[PDB]
Symmetry: none
Subunit: 250 residues, 2 copies
Amino acid sequence: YQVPSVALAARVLKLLSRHKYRQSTLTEIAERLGVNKTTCLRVLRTLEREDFVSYDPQSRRYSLGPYLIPLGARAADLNDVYAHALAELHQVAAHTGMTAVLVKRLRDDRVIYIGSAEPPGDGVRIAVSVGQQFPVYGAAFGRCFLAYDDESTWRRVLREGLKAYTPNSITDEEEYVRLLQEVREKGYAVSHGELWPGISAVAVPVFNQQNKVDLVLSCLTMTSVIQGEDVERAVKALKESAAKVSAWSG
Amino acid sequence: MDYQVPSVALAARVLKLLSRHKYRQSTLTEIAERLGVNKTTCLRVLRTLEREDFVSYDPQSRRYSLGPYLIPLGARAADLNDVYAHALAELHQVAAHTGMTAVLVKRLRDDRVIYIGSAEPPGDGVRIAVSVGQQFPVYGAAFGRCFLAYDDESTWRRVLREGLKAYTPNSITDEEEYVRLLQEVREKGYAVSHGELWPGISAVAVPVFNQQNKVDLVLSCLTMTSVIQGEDVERAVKALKESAAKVSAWSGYQ
């Protein structure tokens, strides 16, 4: 079963976390979600009374509300796995000088940025959109998820087709399979401009109790600046952090 | 109201419950009994939330918990408008409903407090303005008593032994009176001062609690003493409490 209104409440919240829809009128939400204005408004008003959504009558725009702040903080700190993994991002960033990210496998072959940490102190930083979703196959993290799946999950997602985000996105199914073999041997993956042009990443799987991968830790930097020593550093930090997070997955 | 959707209200109650340390890993029975809702009704909502990753389920122990999608929602919500921003917005509501200047006070180290935001009531004419950044002693006036009343009594005794400084003729410097005033603030949930820091100025204040049940923030209303009337103080207490309850929930109080 599915309760249609609760599912609609969730879709609204997910829509309002995208930058384009961070402040959206009723009509923009209805249109984007494909439901009539009255059904949306009912949900939005119930969500508003609980402070899950906020409403600015001066702009007639709805946004994510204040109650999600402590709710999200608690979802992090009440769970041993998430509390330690988010703390580890700060470790990774401080020791590598790269922007560190936690990626999480969702239902329907999607993944999501759960959090990030930017290196401390000053300078330009690379910043990611926290809460952005991605296909489970994309860039360095995609291969960290897929390399330890049973081939029941390999083939279904390969068969759907691989989107070419940039000219270096891996869309050849055979090349992708060889790279998955490579991830298993080395325990990490590197992408150069596969998702965003000029961005490279290093990713490492965090193993759950089934030897499977629900969480990936990632490091991000500019492709033009990355040297071999940077990859090695990122791999050590990420691997060490990953092993501490796996420890808590009991 | 016809725009009130009971299944989404229950989803919210479920998530608020799972955010309490005690109920962080809760069986279906414990959830349904604690909320006073039929277990089947609960299952459908829980499983719907689980499908969207707002809740998780552990098949071993049969317990539900806050799901991981709430983490980036929280971060994106705060990034747009953080708690202090929302607190300021609620102060403008208070100012509008009371016709008083509303003020957000924060505790510092070393027995000081500081104004971190204000909201003058709407319209044109005169009004009381305050300096964002002004610091005061933690014992001073209505807002001082709202911080102190909720510390251990050992702090009351320390602050009292170290001397209450008399700013005006209406300042409370009698130790037995100040203790009685702290006790009653703790009994009643608000404080009122009449010319204790500034001649002519009255204050009504209410504490904001956080997730360790401590008072880091106080919401306060300033008005002129000489024009306060019957229902005014009563009305401001009621508006400040409605606002402080909300901001307490946003600071993680439960």
